[PDB]
Swiss-Prot record, chain A:
Protein name: Glutamate receptor ionotropic, NMDA 1
Cysteine pairs bridged by disulfides in the record: C55-C284
Parent-record interval covered: 25 to 409 of 938
UniProt PTM: NMDA is probably regulated by C-terminal phosphorylation of an isoform of GRIN1 by PKC. Its phosphorylated state is influenced by the formation of the NMDAR-PPP2CB complex and the NMDAR channel activity.
Functional note: Component of N-methyl-D-aspartate (NMDA) receptors (NMDARs) that function as heterotetrameric, ligand-gated cation channels with high calcium permeability and voltage-dependent block by Mg(2+). NMDARs participate in synaptic plasticity for learning and memory formation by contributing to the long-term potentiation (LTP). Channel activation requires binding of the neurotransmitter L-glutamate to the GluN2 subunit, glycine or D-serine binding to the GluN1 subunit, plus membrane depolarization to eliminate channel inhibition by Mg(2+).
Family: Belongs to the glutamate-gated ion channel (TC 1.A.10.1) family. NR1/GRIN1 subfamily.
Side of membrane Extracellular, spans: 1-385
Curated annotation (Swiss-Prot), chain B:
Known role: Component of N-methyl-D-aspartate (NMDA) receptors (NMDARs) that function as heterotetrameric, ligand-gated cation channels with high calcium permeability and voltage-dependent block by Mg(2+). Participates in synaptic plasticity for learning and memory formation. Channel activation requires binding of the neurotransmitter L-glutamate to the GluN2 subunit, glycine or D-serine binding to the GluN1 subunit, plus membrane depolarization to eliminate channel inhibition by Mg(2+). NMDARs mediate simultaneously the potasium efflux and the influx of calcium and sodium.
Top-level taxonomic group: Eukaryota
Membrane side Extracellular: residue ranges: 1-366
Subunit structure: Heterotetramer. Forms heterotetrameric channels composed of two GluN1/zeta subunits (GRIN1), and two identical GluN2/epsilon subunits (GRIN2A, GRIN2B, GRIN2C or GRIN2D) or GluN3 subunits (GRIN3A or GRIN3B) (in vitro). In vivo, the subunit composition may depend on the expression levels of the different subunits. Interacts with PDZ domains of PATJ and DLG4.
Organism this protein belongs to: Homo sapiens
Subcellular location per the Swiss-Prot or TrEMBL entry: Cell membrane; Postsynaptic cell membrane
Glycosylation-annotated residues: N45, N282, N296, N314
Name of the gene encoding the protein in the UniProt record: GRIN2D
Domain writeup: A hydrophobic region that gives rise to the prediction of a transmembrane span does not cross the membrane, but is part of a discontinuously helical region that dips into the membrane and is probably part of the pore and of the selectivity filter.
Protein name in UniProt: Glutamate receptor ionotropic, NMDA 2D
Disulfide links within the chain: C57-C278
Whole-protein residues included: 48 to 436 of 1336
Disorder this protein is connected to according to its UniProt record: Developmental and epileptic encephalopathy 46: A form of epileptic encephalopathy, a heterogeneous group of severe early-onset epilepsies characterized by refractory seizures, neurodevelopmental impairment, and poor prognosis. Development is normal prior to seizure onset, after which cognitive and motor delays become apparent.
Family membership noted in the UniProt record: Belongs to the glutamate-gated ion channel (TC 1.A.10.1) family. NR2D/GRIN2D subfamily.
């Protein structure tokens, strides 16, 4: 029985290691009646004829699962959208090597999809644990008017209700704006001095530009930030002593493709052990129906639990997001970045390196500022008032 | 008198015979000042994920389609999302009347102007309680399955129930796995004793559920099923909610579909005196002004409104009645956000869900 493993990659050289990864699959296992082949297709720099290539070549080759890759553009929803539509609606699983944006976790669209990398919305999961241990019981959110930002805001609030906290005050931006200085006045009078950002490079540009202008980067201010704006065009006026976040193997295509092959290498053996194992459709036009084995193929797919690859400990489950990833925490000193924090997947593990706070201060601050003046309400009662 | 060559595409052999007949009817039905109606009849091949972009752009190229109405005689809504993608690049509006607009696809992609004629999940859970308000049925349960989108179903019903002077009571949330086993399905379904139940499952996922109810005893006597969700073993006691155009004429259905794309844009000509960029590049402009343009639609004694994502904001619709002879009877109506029934009733009377407790009911004189 011929088993085809499809994939869409970028650059000719990267596709070469795909052949190496699939070649080792045959030798690493004792499979006798199972043969693996690799299909290579380059990215078409236009969406209109992008669907033509996947239909006429990959679909007609009856591939088993497809691997996607980051497009050459710095940030675009171009590569993963067409690929998850055509093959996605044939109930053909799609493996996301570099899919990290938070929209593709709804199951209203993109019915079948698996991610080997946790998305951006999961960053808030470790924010709370780091927030809780370092006191920090009062915060303010600065999230832009984007669908991705809403998911991050929801995750923080949906778990904070255990401690009975409403996260003080939340401000909503408009993406693409260039001057948000006036609306930052509402972020000054509050007692809290802990600011959390989750936005893009363009949105974070205006935030970091006026942060030093309003004397917001001095002592007593602590910034918790998202991974997107730590590296990029926002580095021009990024405040010092920023407590950011990053993910290991975030741009290692060769490491991720090996892990994706390993997960399905054992899975394909499990598929050839049951009954009613109908082959995925042959061709792109001849078949006009959803093929038999639906969730059963996905059910075993989201059941792998082994220890292989550089990252290891893959437990794809539920919506298809990785669990307990390896994160890192870094600081910005003199326009130079150094990593101080190491996350093992369970709790934050700090380092002996000094964690210098924004504005050039060493003592640990807290998000609290006393209100000197009090406004008082009274009513007219004859004996009392 | 700005020209407008509206396009019509149909899938299925049934429309092939009547493709030419719909010409004079559609053209004569729609008439607006300063606008030209030139419908074109086309037939598509198959209803599935397929290389539609090969020919859909081919017909779009070289022709001023402006707007095309999508029709399909298929229950599965597996064609709208792939058609949604090609709508984003072309920045042109496509409306589905029957089949294509089977379910509400939200949220959509950035810049998409694809609109539907259907009922949202939340809108299907607000008339179900309106008719239930005047017909008692205080006791109810919730049954959910492994189908995607179940999380919104439980959240939507909970919001409406709370904070009401009636004070609805809940008997917990029931979860069943059709792939587990027959023994597990039957025990969970009969765990809670109630004659009124709420079900949510896929169109093809329903059949395993009905088999469990047959051996669980919750099929005979008087039991109520609310078939709310995507869409011989069919015991009596089922109800659902659908759109007003549940049995509209084929000629009039296309007329309603072509009305929104053409008549809605007539207000633009009042301001001053387009989207054919497929097989072309170096142009993205803006594609969000169309949503606010298509807001004021009113025809056939109905109010049609759309939000940013796009569906029936004011869904003038009807509720189907109980099905006995495999017929889709309709008994409830809902217009102008007001409930209306054709068969008013009090408590449980003859031939309309007689009480399930013949030995626990009394008639008392005073």
């Amino acid at each position: 029985k011929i088993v085809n493993i499809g994939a869409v990659l970028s650059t000719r050289k990267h596709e070469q290691m795909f052949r190496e990864a699939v070649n080792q699959a045959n030798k690493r296992h004792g499979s006798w009646k199972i043969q693996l082949n690799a299909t290579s297709v380059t990215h078409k720099p236009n969406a209109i004829q992008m669907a033509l290539s996947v239909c006429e070549d990959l679909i007609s080759s009856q591939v088993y699962a497809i691997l996607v890759s980051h497009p050459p553009t710095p940030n675009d929803h171009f590569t993963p959208t067409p690929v998850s539509y055509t093959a996605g609606f044939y109930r053909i699983p799609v493996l996301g090597l570099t899919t990290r944006m938070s929209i593709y976790s709804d199951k209203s669209i993109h019915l079948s999809f698996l991610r080997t990398v946790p998305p951006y919305s999961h960053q808030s999961s470790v924010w709370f644990e780091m927030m809780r241990v370092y006191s920090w019981n009062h915060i303010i959110l600065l999230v832009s008017d984007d669908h991705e930002g809403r998911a991050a805001q929801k995750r923080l609030e949906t778990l904070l209700e255990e401690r009975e906290s409403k996260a003080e005050k939340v401000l909503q931006f408009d993406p693409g704006t260039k001057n948000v200085t006036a609306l930052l006045m509402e972020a000054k009078e509050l007692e809290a001095r802990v600011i959390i950002l989750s936005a893009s490079e363009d949105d974070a540009a205006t935030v970091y530009r006026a942060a030093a202008m309003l004397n917001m980067t001095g002592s007593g201010y602590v910034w918790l930030v998202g991974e997107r704006e730590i590296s990029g065009n926002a580095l021009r006026y990024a405040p010092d002593g920023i407590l950011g976040l990053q993910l290991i193997n975030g741009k290692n295509e060769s490491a991720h493709i090996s892990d994706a092959v390993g997960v399905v290498a054992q899975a394909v053996h499990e598929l050839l052990e049951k009954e009613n194992i109908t082959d995925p459709p042959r061709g792109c036009v001849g078949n006009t129906n959803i093929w038999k084995t639906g969730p059963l193929f996905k059910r075993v797919l989201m059941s792998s639990k082994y220890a292989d690859g550089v990252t290891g400990r893959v437990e794809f489950n539920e919506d298809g997001d990785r669990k307990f990833a390896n994160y890192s925490i870094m600081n910005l000193q003199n326009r130079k970045l150094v990593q101080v924090g190491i996350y093992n997947g369970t709790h934050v593990i700090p380092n002996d390196r000094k964690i210098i706070w924004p504005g050039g201060e060493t003592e640990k601050p807290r998000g609290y500022q006393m209100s000197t003046r009090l406004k008082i309400v009274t009513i007219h009662q004859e004996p009392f008032v | 008198a700005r020209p407008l060559n509206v396009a019509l595409v149909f899938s299925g052999p049934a429309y092939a015979a009547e493709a030419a007949r719909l010409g004079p009817a559609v053209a004569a039905a729609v008439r607006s000042p300063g606008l030209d109606v030139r419908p074109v009849a086309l037939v598509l091949n198959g209803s599935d994920p397929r290389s539609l972009v090969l020919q859909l752009c081919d017909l779009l190229s070289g022709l001023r389609v402006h707007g095309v109405v999508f029709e399909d005689d298929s229950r599965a809504p597996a064609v709208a999302p792939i058609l949604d993608f090609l709508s984003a690049q072309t920045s042109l509006p496509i409306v589905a009347v029957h089949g294509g607009a089977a379910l509400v696809l939200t949220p959509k992609e950035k810049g998409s102007t694809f609109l539907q004629l259907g009922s949202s999940t939340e809108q299907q859970l607000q008339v179900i309680f309106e008719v239930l308000e005047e017909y008692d049925w205080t006791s109810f349960v919730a049954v959910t399955t492994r189908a995607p989108g179940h999380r919104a179903f439980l959240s939507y019903i909970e919001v409406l129930t709370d904070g009401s002077l009636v004070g609805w009571e809940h008997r917990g949330a029931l979860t069943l796995d059709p792939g587990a086993g027959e023994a597990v399905l039957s025990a969970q379904l009969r765990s809670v004793s109630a004659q009124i139940r709420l079900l949510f499952c896929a169109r093809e996922e329903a059949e395993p559920v009905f088999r469990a109810a047959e051996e669980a005893g919750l099929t005979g006597s008087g039991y109520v099923w609310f078939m709310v969700g995507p869409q011989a073993p069919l015991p009596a006691g089922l109800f659902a909610v659908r759109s007003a155009g549940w049995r509209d004429d084929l000629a009039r259905r296309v007329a309603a579909g072509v009305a929104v794309v053409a008549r809605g844009a007539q207000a633009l000509l009042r301001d001053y005196g387009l989207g054919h960029d497929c097989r072309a590049q170096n142009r993205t402009h803006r594609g969000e002004s169309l949503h606010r343009y298509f807001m004021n639609i009113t025809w056939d004694n109905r109010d049609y409104s759309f939000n940013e994502d796009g569906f029936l904001v004011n869904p003038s619709l009807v509720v189907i009645s109980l099905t006995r002879d495999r017929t889709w009877e309709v008994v409830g109506s809902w217009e102008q956000q007001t409930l209306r029934l054709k068969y008013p009733l009090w408590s449980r009377y003859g031939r309309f869900l007689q009480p399930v407790d013949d030995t626990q009911h009394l008639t008392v004189a005073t």
